[PDB]
Amino acid sequence: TTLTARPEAITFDPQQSALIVVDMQNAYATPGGYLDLAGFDVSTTRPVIANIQTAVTAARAAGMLIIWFQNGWDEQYVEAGGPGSPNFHKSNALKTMRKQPQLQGKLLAKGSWDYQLVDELVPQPGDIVLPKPRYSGFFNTPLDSILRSRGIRHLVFTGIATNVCVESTLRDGFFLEYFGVVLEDATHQAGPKFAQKAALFNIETFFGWVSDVETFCDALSP
Amino acid sequence: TTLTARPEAITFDPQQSALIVVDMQNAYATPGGYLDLAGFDVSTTRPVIANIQTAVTAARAAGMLIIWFQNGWDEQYVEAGGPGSPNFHKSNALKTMRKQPQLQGKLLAKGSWDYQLVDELVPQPGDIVLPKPRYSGFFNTPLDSILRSRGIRHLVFTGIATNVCVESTLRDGFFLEYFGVVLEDATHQAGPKFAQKAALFNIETFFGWVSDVETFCDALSP
């Protein structure tokens, strides 16, 4: 398949490719979730959700592997690292719960509402659903092994946050010799609008390719 | 020692810390280098070189290990990967040399002027100088091994490009449980000015700490 993209069009075989849906959890997309409680603007993610559903339908119909990430930890946050991990000190979820003990054990907690995939996005049998304990899906997980076991070299990225979990997984994928493309209108940033712009620029200019959902779906139609 | 920083101050032992000077080569800081020839703006890097000299002097006098990176490859670019690597298709140096054949073998090439550290920055006995074949110093190198072998958990980052090799190495350091701080006035971005602001925003908000050279030197003086 030839996919129109920035900075130029690329080729991939859908049957040797994966669509990765990064962290489409209430924490990252839904009012009252972690990012919202932590002061980030989540009011504009509805079109991102619908666009991911569209992209998943097309990708699965074309034979691409669908991989869903869920970011977060056990309710006791053992897996988040204690004070000896920089993650303990950087996580805005952990910071929010330290400021608001009423939320302690709810943000990004396995089995909780915050951790759930948003209602509109439901993995299907045969999809892979991966928990990850840090922003990048290529650290501390079997993601690389899962992809290599199927000969997959091309990754199409969707999800939240463009500049954090999405971009980190795409950047680390590049260092592991994966070709990564992001569907820009199926992502949303964590931060001001310049964070979306800069993540797309860094991806396009140094790490991978940028396309969009309509272009992706039309490229898959055969 | 307390280092005042964004989003809050941190504490560290300079003896168990490293100052990393990322890719301060002619390619990234000097007129007529790769970045300049590739259309990026390098007209403001003179104060960055000066600020790195100041930070390197304070770091060494405090017992911090100095690590210098040089990004690049053999002159035949075997180490940049062939067409099977996304690096072959993304590297703006390889792009530029395919566009301007007079430059083939001259950009980011071991033994070339482009590849040299800028004249003003001279590694000293006891420092470590490391080549790296991709943007992140934590892939395809012994960097993690070197730091673990000395019990180092705190990394202070300087160099170019803030949003590419600097941020990538800091992000990956975080995934390897390192506490990373960037000295903002000892860096420069590759791209428009929003790429500087956005890299610092991502580091401050999700990955590590932002400080500056004068704050760093003052913190080390006892």
Coordinates of C-alpha atoms in Angstrom, one line a residue:
Chain A
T1 CA 0.0 0.0 0.0
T2 CA 1.2 3.5 -0.8
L3 CA 0.2 6.0 1.9
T4 CA 0.3 9.7 1.2
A5 CA 2.1 11.4 4.1
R6 CA 4.6 14.1 5.2
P7 CA 7.3 14.6 4.4
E8 CA 6.7 12.2 1.5
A9 CA 4.5 9.2 0.7
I10 CA 5.5 5.8 2.1
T11 CA 4.8 2.1 1.4
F12 CA 3.7 -0.6 3.8
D13 CA 2.1 -4.0 3.6
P14 CA -0.9 -3.9 5.9
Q15 CA -0.5 -7.6 6.6
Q16 CA 3.0 -6.8 7.9
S17 CA 1.9 -3.7 9.8
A18 CA 0.2 -2.8 13.1
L19 CA -2.1 -0.1 14.2
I20 CA -1.3 1.0 17.7
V21 CA -4.0 2.8 19.8
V22 CA -2.0 4.6 22.5
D23 CA -3.7 5.0 25.9
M24 CA -7.3 5.8 24.8
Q25 CA -8.4 5.6 28.5
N26 CA -10.8 7.8 30.4
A27 CA -7.6 9.1 32.1
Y28 CA -6.5 10.6 28.8
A29 CA -9.7 11.4 26.9
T30 CA -12.6 11.9 29.3
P31 CA -13.8 14.8 31.5
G32 CA -13.3 13.9 35.1
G33 CA -10.3 11.7 34.2
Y34 CA -6.7 12.1 35.3
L35 CA -5.6 14.6 32.7
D36 CA -8.6 16.8 33.3
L37 CA -8.2 16.6 37.1
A38 CA -4.5 17.4 36.6
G39 CA -5.3 20.7 34.7
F40 CA -5.0 19.6 31.1
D41 CA -7.6 20.5 28.5
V42 CA -9.5 17.4 27.4
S43 CA -12.6 19.1 26.0
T44 CA -11.8 18.5 22.3
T45 CA -11.1 14.7 22.2
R46 CA -14.5 13.6 20.9
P47 CA -13.4 13.8 17.3
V48 CA -10.2 11.9 18.1
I49 CA -12.2 9.1 19.6
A50 CA -14.5 8.8 16.5
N51 CA -11.5 9.1 14.2
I52 CA -9.7 6.2 16.0
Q53 CA -12.8 4.0 15.7
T54 CA -12.8 4.8 11.9
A55 CA -9.1 4.0 11.6
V56 CA -9.4 0.7 13.6
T57 CA -12.3 -0.5 11.4
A58 CA -10.2 0.1 8.2
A59 CA -7.0 -1.3 9.6
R60 CA -8.6 -4.5 10.9
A61 CA -10.4 -5.0 7.5
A62 CA -7.1 -4.8 5.8
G63 CA -5.4 -7.4 8.0
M64 CA -3.4 -5.1 10.2
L65 CA -2.7 -6.1 13.8
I66 CA -4.5 -3.9 16.3
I67 CA -2.6 -3.2 19.5
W68 CA -4.2 -1.3 22.3
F69 CA -2.1 0.3 25.1
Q70 CA -3.3 0.9 28.6
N71 CA -1.0 3.1 30.7
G72 CA -1.1 2.6 34.5
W73 CA -0.4 0.5 37.5
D74 CA -1.6 -1.6 40.4
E75 CA -3.8 0.3 42.8
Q76 CA -0.9 0.5 45.3
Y77 CA 1.4 1.9 42.6
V78 CA 4.1 -0.6 43.3
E79 CA 4.6 -0.8 39.5
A80 CA 5.0 3.0 39.3
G81 CA 8.3 3.0 41.1
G82 CA 8.7 4.4 44.6
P83 CA 10.6 7.5 45.5
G84 CA 13.8 5.9 43.9
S85 CA 12.2 6.1 40.4
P86 CA 12.0 9.4 38.5
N87 CA 8.5 8.2 37.5
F88 CA 7.3 8.6 41.1
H89 CA 8.4 12.3 40.9
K90 CA 7.3 13.1 37.4
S91 CA 3.9 11.4 37.0
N92 CA 1.2 14.1 37.1
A93 CA -1.2 11.3 38.1
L94 CA 0.9 10.5 41.2
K95 CA 1.3 14.3 41.9
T96 CA -2.4 14.9 41.7
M97 CA -3.2 12.1 44.1
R98 CA -0.5 13.3 46.5
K99 CA -2.3 16.7 46.5
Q100 CA -5.7 15.1 46.6
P101 CA -5.7 12.0 48.8
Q102 CA -9.4 11.4 48.0
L103 CA -8.2 10.3 44.6
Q104 CA -5.4 8.0 46.0
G105 CA -5.5 4.7 44.2
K106 CA -8.0 5.8 41.5
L107 CA -5.8 7.6 38.9
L108 CA -4.3 5.2 36.3
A109 CA -5.2 2.2 38.5
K110 CA -5.8 -1.2 36.9
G111 CA -9.4 -2.2 37.3
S112 CA -10.6 1.4 37.8
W113 CA -12.7 3.7 35.7
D114 CA -9.8 6.1 35.0
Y115 CA -7.9 3.1 33.6
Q116 CA -10.7 1.8 31.4
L117 CA -10.6 2.3 27.6
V118 CA -13.2 4.9 26.7
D119 CA -16.7 3.4 26.1
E120 CA -16.6 3.8 22.3
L121 CA -13.4 1.8 21.8
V122 CA -13.7 -1.9 22.5
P123 CA -10.9 -4.4 21.5
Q124 CA -11.9 -7.4 19.5
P125 CA -10.7 -11.0 19.8
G126 CA -7.4 -11.4 18.2
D127 CA -6.3 -7.8 19.0
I128 CA -3.5 -7.4 21.5
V129 CA -4.1 -5.4 24.6
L130 CA -0.9 -4.3 26.4
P131 CA -0.5 -2.8 29.8
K132 CA 2.5 -0.5 30.1
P133 CA 4.0 1.0 33.2
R134 CA 5.8 4.0 31.6
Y135 CA 5.1 6.4 28.8
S136 CA 6.8 4.4 26.1
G137 CA 5.4 1.1 24.9
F138 CA 8.9 -0.1 24.0
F139 CA 10.3 -0.2 27.6
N140 CA 9.4 -2.9 30.1
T141 CA 6.9 -4.7 27.8
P142 CA 6.8 -7.5 25.3
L143 CA 5.8 -5.1 22.5
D144 CA 9.0 -5.4 20.4
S145 CA 8.9 -9.2 20.8
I146 CA 5.2 -9.3 19.7
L147 CA 5.9 -7.3 16.6
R148 CA 9.1 -9.1 15.6
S149 CA 7.4 -12.5 16.1
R150 CA 5.1 -11.5 13.2
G151 CA 7.7 -9.8 11.1
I152 CA 6.1 -6.4 11.5
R153 CA 8.2 -3.4 10.7
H154 CA 5.6 -0.7 10.1
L155 CA 3.6 1.0 12.9
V156 CA 0.7 3.3 12.5
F157 CA 0.1 5.4 15.6
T158 CA -3.0 6.9 17.1
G159 CA -4.0 8.0 20.6
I160 CA -3.0 10.3 23.5
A161 CA -0.8 12.0 24.3
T162 CA 0.8 13.0 21.0
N163 CA 3.8 14.5 22.7
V164 CA 4.2 12.0 25.5
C165 CA 3.2 8.3 25.1
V166 CA 2.6 8.5 21.4
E167 CA 5.8 10.4 20.5
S168 CA 7.9 8.4 23.0
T169 CA 6.7 5.0 21.6
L170 CA 7.3 6.3 18.0
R171 CA 10.7 7.6 18.8
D172 CA 11.8 4.4 20.5
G173 CA 10.3 2.4 17.7
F174 CA 12.6 4.4 15.3
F175 CA 15.6 3.4 17.5
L176 CA 14.5 -0.3 17.2
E177 CA 14.3 0.1 13.3
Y178 CA 10.5 0.4 13.0
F179 CA 9.0 2.7 10.4
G180 CA 6.4 4.8 12.2
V181 CA 3.6 7.0 10.9
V182 CA 1.2 9.0 13.0
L183 CA -2.4 9.8 12.0
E184 CA -2.5 13.4 13.1
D185 CA -6.3 13.8 13.5
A186 CA -6.4 10.7 15.6
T187 CA -4.1 12.1 18.3
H188 CA -4.4 14.7 21.0
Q189 CA -1.7 16.4 23.0
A190 CA -1.2 16.9 26.7
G191 CA -0.4 20.6 27.0
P192 CA -0.9 23.7 25.0
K193 CA -1.6 23.5 21.2
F194 CA 2.1 24.1 20.5
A195 CA 2.7 20.7 22.0
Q196 CA 0.6 19.1 19.2
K197 CA 2.4 21.1 16.6
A198 CA 5.8 20.4 17.9
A199 CA 5.3 16.6 18.3
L200 CA 4.1 16.4 14.7
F201 CA 7.0 18.5 13.5
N202 CA 9.5 16.4 15.4
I203 CA 8.0 13.2 14.0
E204 CA 7.8 14.4 10.4
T205 CA 11.3 16.0 10.5
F206 CA 13.4 13.4 12.4
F207 CA 11.6 10.2 13.3
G208 CA 8.8 9.1 11.0
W209 CA 5.8 10.2 8.9
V210 CA 2.5 12.0 9.4
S211 CA -0.7 11.2 7.6
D212 CA -4.4 11.3 8.6
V213 CA -7.4 9.0 9.0
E214 CA -9.1 9.7 5.7
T215 CA -5.9 9.2 3.7
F216 CA -5.1 6.0 5.7
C217 CA -8.6 4.5 5.1
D218 CA -8.6 5.3 1.4
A219 CA -5.1 3.9 1.0
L220 CA -6.4 0.6 2.6
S221 CA -9.5 0.3 0.4
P222 CA -8.1 -2.3 -2.0
Chain B
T1 CA 23.1 19.3 46.9
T2 CA 19.9 21.2 46.0
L3 CA 19.5 22.3 42.3
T4 CA 16.8 24.8 41.8
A5 CA 14.8 23.7 38.8
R6 CA 11.4 23.6 37.1
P7 CA 8.9 22.3 38.0
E8 CA 10.5 22.0 41.5
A9 CA 14.0 21.8 43.0
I10 CA 15.8 18.5 43.1
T11 CA 18.6 17.1 45.2
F12 CA 21.5 15.1 44.0
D13 CA 25.1 14.2 44.7
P14 CA 27.4 15.6 42.0
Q15 CA 29.8 12.7 42.6
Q16 CA 27.1 10.3 41.6
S17 CA 26.1 12.4 38.6
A18 CA 27.2 13.0 35.0
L19 CA 27.2 16.0 32.8
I20 CA 26.4 14.9 29.2
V21 CA 27.4 17.2 26.3
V22 CA 25.3 16.1 23.4
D23 CA 26.7 16.4 19.9
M24 CA 28.5 19.7 20.1
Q25 CA 30.1 19.1 16.7
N26 CA 30.5 21.5 13.8
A27 CA 27.5 19.7 12.2
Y28 CA 25.2 21.1 14.9
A29 CA 26.7 24.4 16.1
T30 CA 29.0 25.9 13.4
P31 CA 28.2 27.9 10.3
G32 CA 28.7 25.6 7.2
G33 CA 27.9 22.5 9.3
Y34 CA 25.3 19.9 8.4
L35 CA 22.4 21.7 10.2
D36 CA 23.3 25.0 8.6
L37 CA 23.6 23.4 5.1
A38 CA 20.3 21.5 5.7
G39 CA 18.4 24.8 6.2
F40 CA 18.3 24.9 10.0
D41 CA 19.2 28.1 11.9
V42 CA 22.5 27.9 13.8
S43 CA 23.1 31.7 14.0
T44 CA 22.6 31.8 17.8
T45 CA 24.8 28.9 19.0
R46 CA 27.8 30.9 20.1
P47 CA 26.4 31.6 23.6
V48 CA 25.5 28.0 23.9
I49 CA 29.1 26.9 23.4
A50 CA 30.2 29.5 25.9
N51 CA 27.5 28.3 28.4
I52 CA 28.6 24.7 28.0
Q53 CA 32.3 25.6 28.7
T54 CA 31.1 27.2 31.9
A55 CA 29.0 24.2 32.9
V56 CA 31.8 21.7 32.0
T57 CA 34.2 23.6 34.2
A58 CA 31.9 23.7 37.2
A59 CA 30.9 20.0 36.7
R60 CA 34.5 18.8 36.6
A61 CA 35.6 20.8 39.6
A62 CA 32.7 19.2 41.5
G63 CA 33.7 15.6 40.6
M64 CA 30.9 15.1 38.1
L65 CA 31.8 12.8 35.2
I66 CA 31.8 14.5 31.8
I67 CA 30.5 12.5 28.9
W68 CA 30.8 13.9 25.3
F69 CA 28.8 12.5 22.5
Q70 CA 29.6 12.6 18.8
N71 CA 26.8 11.6 16.4
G72 CA 27.6 10.1 13.0
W73 CA 29.0 7.3 11.0
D74 CA 31.8 5.8 8.9
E75 CA 32.3 7.8 5.7
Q76 CA 30.5 5.2 3.6
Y77 CA 27.5 5.5 6.0
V78 CA 27.3 1.7 6.5
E79 CA 26.6 2.5 10.2
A80 CA 23.6 4.8 9.3
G81 CA 21.8 1.7 8.0
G82 CA 20.7 1.0 4.4
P83 CA 17.3 1.4 2.9
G84 CA 16.0 -1.2 5.4
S85 CA 16.4 1.3 8.2
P86 CA 14.1 4.2 8.8
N87 CA 17.3 6.2 9.7
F88 CA 18.4 6.0 6.1
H89 CA 15.1 7.6 5.1
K90 CA 14.8 10.2 7.9
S91 CA 18.4 11.5 8.4
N92 CA 18.4 15.1 7.2
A93 CA 22.2 14.7 6.7
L94 CA 21.8 11.8 4.4
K95 CA 18.9 13.7 2.7
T96 CA 21.1 16.8 2.3
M97 CA 24.0 14.8 0.8
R98 CA 21.7 13.0 -1.7
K99 CA 20.4 16.5 -2.7
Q100 CA 24.0 18.0 -2.9
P101 CA 26.4 15.3 -4.1
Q102 CA 29.4 17.6 -3.5
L103 CA 28.8 16.9 0.2
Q104 CA 28.6 13.1 0.0
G105 CA 30.9 11.7 2.7
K106 CA 31.4 15.1 4.3
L107 CA 28.5 15.3 6.7
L108 CA 28.5 13.5 10.1
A109 CA 31.4 11.4 8.8
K110 CA 34.1 10.0 11.1
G111 CA 37.3 11.8 10.2
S112 CA 35.5 14.8 8.8
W113 CA 35.5 18.4 9.9
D114 CA 31.7 18.3 10.3
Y115 CA 32.0 15.4 12.7
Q116 CA 34.6 17.1 14.9
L117 CA 33.7 18.7 18.2
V118 CA 33.8 22.4 17.9
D119 CA 37.3 23.9 18.4
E120 CA 36.3 25.5 21.7
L121 CA 35.2 22.3 23.4
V122 CA 38.1 20.1 24.3
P123 CA 37.6 16.8 26.2
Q124 CA 40.0 16.4 29.1
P125 CA 41.7 13.3 30.6
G126 CA 39.1 11.4 32.7
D127 CA 36.2 12.4 30.4
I128 CA 34.5 9.9 28.3
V129 CA 33.9 10.5 24.6
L130 CA 31.3 8.3 23.0
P131 CA 30.2 7.9 19.3
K132 CA 26.5 7.2 18.7
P133 CA 24.9 6.0 15.5
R134 CA 21.4 7.3 16.2
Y135 CA 19.8 10.3 17.9
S136 CA 19.5 8.7 21.4
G137 CA 22.6 8.0 23.3
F138 CA 20.8 5.1 25.1
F139 CA 20.5 2.9 22.0
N140 CA 23.3 0.9 20.4
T141 CA 25.9 2.2 22.9
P142 CA 27.5 1.3 26.2
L143 CA 26.1 4.5 27.8
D144 CA 23.8 2.8 30.3
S145 CA 26.5 0.3 31.2
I146 CA 29.0 3.1 31.8
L147 CA 26.6 5.0 34.1
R148 CA 25.5 1.9 36.0
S149 CA 29.1 0.8 36.5
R150 CA 29.7 4.1 38.4
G151 CA 26.4 4.2 40.3
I152 CA 25.3 7.3 38.5
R153 CA 21.6 8.1 38.6
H154 CA 21.5 11.8 37.8
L155 CA 22.2 13.2 34.4
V156 CA 22.6 16.9 33.5
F157 CA 22.1 17.5 29.8
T158 CA 23.6 20.1 27.5
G159 CA 24.0 20.3 23.7
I160 CA 22.2 20.1 20.4
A161 CA 19.5 19.5 19.3
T162 CA 17.3 20.1 22.3
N163 CA 14.3 18.4 20.7
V164 CA 16.2 15.6 18.9
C165 CA 19.3 14.0 20.4
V166 CA 19.1 15.8 23.7
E167 CA 15.4 15.2 24.4
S168 CA 15.6 11.6 23.0
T169 CA 18.5 10.7 25.3
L170 CA 16.8 12.3 28.3
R171 CA 13.4 10.6 27.6
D172 CA 15.2 7.2 27.2
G173 CA 17.2 7.9 30.4
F174 CA 13.9 8.4 32.2
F175 CA 12.7 5.0 30.9
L176 CA 16.0 3.6 32.3
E177 CA 15.2 5.2 35.7
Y178 CA 17.7 8.1 35.4
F179 CA 16.9 11.6 36.8
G180 CA 17.5 13.9 33.9
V181 CA 17.9 17.7 34.1
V182 CA 18.5 19.9 31.1
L183 CA 20.3 23.3 31.3
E184 CA 18.1 25.3 29.0
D185 CA 20.6 28.0 28.1
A186 CA 23.2 25.3 27.2
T187 CA 21.0 23.9 24.5
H188 CA 19.7 24.8 21.0
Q189 CA 16.9 23.3 19.0
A190 CA 16.9 22.0 15.4
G191 CA 13.9 23.7 13.9
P192 CA 11.8 26.8 14.6
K193 CA 11.8 28.4 18.1
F194 CA 8.7 26.6 19.2
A195 CA 10.7 23.4 19.1
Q196 CA 12.9 24.7 21.9
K197 CA 9.9 25.8 24.0
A198 CA 8.1 22.5 23.4
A199 CA 11.0 20.3 24.2
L200 CA 11.6 22.1 27.5
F201 CA 7.8 21.9 28.2
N202 CA 7.8 18.1 27.6
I203 CA 10.9 17.6 29.8
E204 CA 9.6 19.8 32.6
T205 CA 6.1 18.4 32.6
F206 CA 6.7 14.7 32.0
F207 CA 10.3 13.5 31.9
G208 CA 12.7 15.5 34.0
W209 CA 13.8 18.9 35.2
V210 CA 14.8 22.2 33.6
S211 CA 17.5 24.5 35.1
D212 CA 20.2 26.8 33.7
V213 CA 23.9 27.1 33.7
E214 CA 24.3 29.9 36.4
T215 CA 21.9 28.0 38.7
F216 CA 23.9 24.8 38.1
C217 CA 27.3 26.4 38.8
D218 CA 26.0 28.1 41.9
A219 CA 24.5 24.8 43.2
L220 CA 27.9 23.1 42.7
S221 CA 30.1 25.8 44.3
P222 CA 30.3 24.3 47.8

